Design a binder for this molecule. Sequence first.
Ligand SMILES: NC(=O)c1ccc[n+]([C@@H]2O[C@H](COP(=O)([O-])OP(=O)(O)OC[C@H]3O[C@@H](n4cnc5c(N)ncnc54)[C@H](O)[C@@H]3O)[C@@H](O)[C@H]2O)c1
Ligand SMILES: NC(=O)c1ccc[n+]([C@@H]2O[C@H](COP(=O)([O-])OP(=O)(O)OC[C@H]3O[C@@H](n4cnc5c(N)ncnc54)[C@H](O)[C@@H]3O)[C@@H](O)[C@H]2O)c1
Ligand SMILES: NC(=O)c1ccc[n+]([C@@H]2O[C@H](COP(=O)([O-])OP(=O)(O)OC[C@H]3O[C@@H](n4cnc5c(N)ncnc54)[C@H](O)[C@@H]3O)[C@@H](O)[C@H]2O)c1
Ligand SMILES: NC(=O)c1ccc[n+]([C@@H]2O[C@H](COP(=O)([O-])OP(=O)(O)OC[C@H]3O[C@@H](n4cnc5c(N)ncnc54)[C@H](O)[C@@H]3O)[C@@H](O)[C@H]2O)c1
Ligand SMILES: CCCCCCc1cc(O)c(Oc2ccccc2C)cc1F
Ligand SMILES: CCCCCCc1cc(O)c(Oc2ccccc2C)cc1F
Ligand SMILES: CCCCCCc1cc(O)c(Oc2ccccc2C)cc1F
Ligand SMILES: CCCCCCc1cc(O)c(Oc2ccccc2C)cc1F
Lengths: 257, 257, 257, 257
Amino acid sequence: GFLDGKRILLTGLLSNRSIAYGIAKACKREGAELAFTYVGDRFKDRITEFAAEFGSELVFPCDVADDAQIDALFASLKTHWDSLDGLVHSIGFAPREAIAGDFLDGLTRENFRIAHDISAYSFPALAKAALPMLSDDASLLTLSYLGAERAIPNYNTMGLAKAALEASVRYLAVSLGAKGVRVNAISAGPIKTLAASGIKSFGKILDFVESNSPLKRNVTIEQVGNAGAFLLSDLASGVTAEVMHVDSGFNAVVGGM
Amino acid sequence: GFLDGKRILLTGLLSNRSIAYGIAKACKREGAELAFTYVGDRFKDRITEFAAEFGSELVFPCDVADDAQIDALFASLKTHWDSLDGLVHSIGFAPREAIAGDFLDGLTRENFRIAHDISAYSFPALAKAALPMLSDDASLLTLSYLGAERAIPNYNTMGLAKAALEASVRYLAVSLGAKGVRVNAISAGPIKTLAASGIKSFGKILDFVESNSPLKRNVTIEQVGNAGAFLLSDLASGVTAEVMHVDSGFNAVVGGM
Amino acid sequence: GFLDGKRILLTGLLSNRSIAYGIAKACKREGAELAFTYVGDRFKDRITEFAAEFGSELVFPCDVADDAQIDALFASLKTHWDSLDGLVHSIGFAPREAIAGDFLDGLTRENFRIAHDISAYSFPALAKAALPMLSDDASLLTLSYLGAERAIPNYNTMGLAKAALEASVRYLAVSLGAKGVRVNAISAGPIKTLAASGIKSFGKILDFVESNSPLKRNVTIEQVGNAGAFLLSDLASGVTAEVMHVDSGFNAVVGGM
Amino acid sequence: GFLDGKRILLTGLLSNRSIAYGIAKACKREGAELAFTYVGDRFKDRITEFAAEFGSELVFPCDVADDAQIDALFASLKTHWDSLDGLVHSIGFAPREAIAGDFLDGLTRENFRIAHDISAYSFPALAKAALPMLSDDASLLTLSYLGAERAIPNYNTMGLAKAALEASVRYLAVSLGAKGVRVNAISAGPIKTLAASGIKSFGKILDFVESNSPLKRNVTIEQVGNAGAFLLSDLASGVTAEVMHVDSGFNAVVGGM
Ligand SMILES: NC(=O)c1ccc[n+]([C@@H]2O[C@H](COP(=O)([O-])OP(=O)(O)OC[C@H]3O[C@@H](n4cnc5c(N)ncnc54)[C@H](O)[C@@H]3O)[C@@H](O)[C@H]2O)c1
Ligand SMILES: NC(=O)c1ccc[n+]([C@@H]2O[C@H](COP(=O)([O-])OP(=O)(O)OC[C@H]3O[C@@H](n4cnc5c(N)ncnc54)[C@H](O)[C@@H]3O)[C@@H](O)[C@H]2O)c1
Ligand SMILES: NC(=O)c1ccc[n+]([C@@H]2O[C@H](COP(=O)([O-])OP(=O)(O)OC[C@H]3O[C@@H](n4cnc5c(N)ncnc54)[C@H](O)[C@@H]3O)[C@@H](O)[C@H]2O)c1
Ligand SMILES: NC(=O)c1ccc[n+]([C@@H]2O[C@H](COP(=O)([O-])OP(=O)(O)OC[C@H]3O[C@@H](n4cnc5c(N)ncnc54)[C@H](O)[C@@H]3O)[C@@H](O)[C@H]2O)c1
Ligand SMILES: CCCCCCc1cc(O)c(Oc2ccccc2C)cc1F
Ligand SMILES: CCCCCCc1cc(O)c(Oc2ccccc2C)cc1F
Ligand SMILES: CCCCCCc1cc(O)c(Oc2ccccc2C)cc1F
Ligand SMILES: CCCCCCc1cc(O)c(Oc2ccccc2C)cc1F
């Protein structure tokens, strides 16, 4: 397959509906060797099973709020892999009130700080910590959403954090590019994941995308997974600093009128 | 003039080269009544003189790192003005290392936090605190830079923060818009201000814009000031959620080849 | 006013609902001297009355399909004005079928040709013909619509032509910029004009913008007019190659969900 | 491979440096069956050899200036293939003067017409003619350049045509999407092809991209080819109406300062 030999670390594989699961499944199909992170000792068994499904026993704890855990992740990974070819950042968080209702009602300094710390900062932070072991042709991928580009109801503080995240893709691409490393994002359409059980204006958004997207259907984690596998692969060696929409074309229309 | 009767609070007027000074001068010319903020007791005399130049004695301290000072600013302003028609956010900061050299070398969690706190969060934070006294036709303006949209050498962490800031313009526009309040940014070209004495890759950027911009010249604080006055005025009542480039058209070209 | 002394030629003033009428009214208020074009001998009396309303008797025929008429327009204007400070291009056309229903059903080579000839080519063609008499600080303005940027139902072939038009703003800005001339567009929201009595999916779009735009209201020709006057004026001397949205912020949201 | 069974028609394969050749080579590797167009009887032998290199004897004449040839192309193809799964539009032309020097000097109505007819109109025209035989999961791909988005010296009239072309990608995506057909573009970086021997400001642009792109290298037809194969494949079933940059990240920076 087109990822034969590539060794890829995936964050954010929480359930079999996680975007990271679709990415994991596609990467495994195309021949990659995988390793996985988790947060909280209670998910250790679950992530261990997922890893074994993908022929892997490489699982490591990493709460990205913690500098020591970020450093320890790569120290641990390095005892198995002398080099890293891929990194999937599929991590996000904002306090409930900061992604519900009116943008200002949910705005506080702490809510802003946490959302940007976990959803934006953590991507280049992982990149920096991984750098000494990145292969020259490594590829780093993060996940964003159209709320970074345009105001979408309820997305609120997460829209700000995703905008910073997309900017980080561009600055990372420049920092790491002379070495040969690529950095991209996928702007994925709505998919019913665990994170989506935050606000269900989600049902409304899901219906709207199905009705108004050019393909008249919502995307799947298989479709996002395949796009992800592509970006992580040498097939995409000409592509960096890109935010690729995998959203049935929804971003490109004015819908609903 | 086209701002007759409008009462406008300006942050960030540090010296007579400040972008806020150009905005202040243009607003005053067009008939606005002005008030000003400052940071640190040592600038109290200087900002007091600027205010008097613009026919004003309304000066208030406000370090935007401090919730109590943000709240106290509007409590103080309210003892003079029962309503606020305009707000100019012309504030930014990142630690020196976070806007010099390689993006990852200057990246730390604290540097990221501070840059986003001061340069991005503070805009909607001031908006929220001002809201109870905003007039229905009020207009809020912030200042951004092309580094939000594309990777520019040295801008680094500030590029991420400005991207979040531009997103905040869109979410603020939605939150405040049903009331009638407008929220916009100007993406200004390089201008030799006190903030510009950070990294002088500035001389290089300044030369490059002069050589490659469509108008073959750098912008002035008078030009940014006039665009600002326009946005704060009822002339711009159809315009909100916009990031307007005032940069001699530089953003629209691929230059230097 | 801020256009005192400026001499501005306006195309496209067809009725008192025309966007050009709002622009004309705003320019006249701010002190400009106006001249006007028309198409077809039957509109000569009507445009003559409009011109007199704005203190002008300067009216000239110009079908932009015709090279000879474009050249003759400026020869005629030059017998009155030795220089031209402003040009408003507020002209568009596509055959009915090319802006109704399915994009491919209405697509023919001739429909494509006509739409691009009249709606896109004519802007830089007028600029080129005007160039020998343009003042160094002249300002050229055209009108576009969000359908250039994103696919909007029914807009179809006009979306392609407006995309080419917006590109022409950028290339014109470079060509004319070293002289000092500025070139911009306003991307206006829907306004019930004569052109809007093409397809009334217009009623639907109008309702959708009112319901979903940040300001929760449609724009007016007064609002587009004032933005236009600003762009044509020295207030906007820092602004070129820009496509400014005057659409109540509608472009910046994902609405309707 | 990931295009096994897919039947793909490629236009624009002129020499072994053509972007279409890289696309052809990648599609063939991934298992596609190919057919090819050519213009002018003198290239019949050359295109016949290329086709045989890719295991094909399916070659057809098609000058896209001619409606009858467009219709005859698909009538001919249909005698071999009852369905079409992919279409690569890798065609462009503007008269020499319209892509050299100053934008207005090279601007004429005929130059504008020809550039838009051949470089923009021809894409949806081929789509419309192919439609009756397109498979439900078909994928249509065109090639664009950054000059559509920003003004690049010399690109001039072709910048306008590529902007219209990118808009056509969005309108085509909507028209064909309910059926299930996808439509995308690749915005490729400079590559030394036969078309590039127009103006050699090309050497300058090539050097500039190598020096300033994040990956510090120019793209290859292999890299554009692989991205193309991806877009034409079911791996990209979630992706439509997209303009994907394959340009070493050059679009995402401000370079050269
Ligand atoms: N589901 C969608 O509709 C959608 C659309 C566009 C983008 N995205 C993005 O895709 C990414 C994945 O989300 P998802 O949809 O797969 O939902 P998910 O719940 O399956 O994945 C979210 C992950 O974030 C991880 N996470 C949260 N806080 C963390 C921390 N402090 N340290 C480490 N990990 C942490 C969680 O463990 C979880 O694995 C997110 O960035 C999300 O923003 C999702
Ligand atoms: N000068 C340029 O080239 C340029 C270009 C584009 C955008 N901008 C932006 O314009 C805005 C104004 O900068 P400037 O160029 O006028 O330089 P400046 O130094 O004159 O203004 C910066 C202001 O930020 C204020 N500030 C910093 N920390 C603060 C805090 N904690 N609380 C309150 N105020 C604080 C300073 O007091 C100062 O008044 C900034 O947002 C800047 O990012 C500047
Ligand atoms: N009305 C809207 O909702 C809206 C929104 C965005 C942009 N626009 C654009 O604003 C501009 C003005 O349109 P409008 O809304 O004021 O409607 P309008 O009917 O009042 O103006 C259209 C003008 O195009 C002129 N025109 C058509 N063919 C011509 C030719 N061959 N030569 C010279 N002039 C010709 C007509 O004479 C008419 O004056 C157009 O470019 C339009 O695309 C309109
Ligand atoms: N080479 C680059 O740097 C570059 C960069 C970005 C985009 N592009 C685009 O990629 C596409 C392919 O160009 P290329 O670089 O492979 O150069 P090329 O010369 O190899 O391909 C151009 C093709 O256009 C075809 N063509 C011209 N007129 C035609 C007509 N009337 N009917 C049918 N075909 C016609 C030619 O036959 C030729 O095959 C073009 O659209 C071009 O604009 C090229
Ligand atoms: C807000 C209306 C539409 C949002 C749907 C798309 C979407 C985007 C996401 O970034 C997403 O993941 C998160 C959302 C909020 C907080 C944390 C995460 C991981 C989940 C999700 F369903
Ligand atoms: C990094 C190369 C080009 C940057 C020049 C434009 C510019 C943009 C700015 O946002 C600016 O103001 C700051 C920059 C860094 C940190 C804080 C501020 C206020 C100053 C400034 F000169
Ligand atoms: C297609 C749905 C929304 C379109 C509304 C906005 C609009 C945009 C326009 O560019 C416009 O003017 C024309 C439209 C088609 C053909 C010719 C013109 C001048 C009129 C008009 F009402
Ligand atoms: C104008 C300066 C940079 C242009 C380089 C990239 C490029 C873009 C193209 O679209 C291209 O193909 C054509 C260019 C002009 C006319 C016709 C074609 C096919 C060739 C080409 F080298």
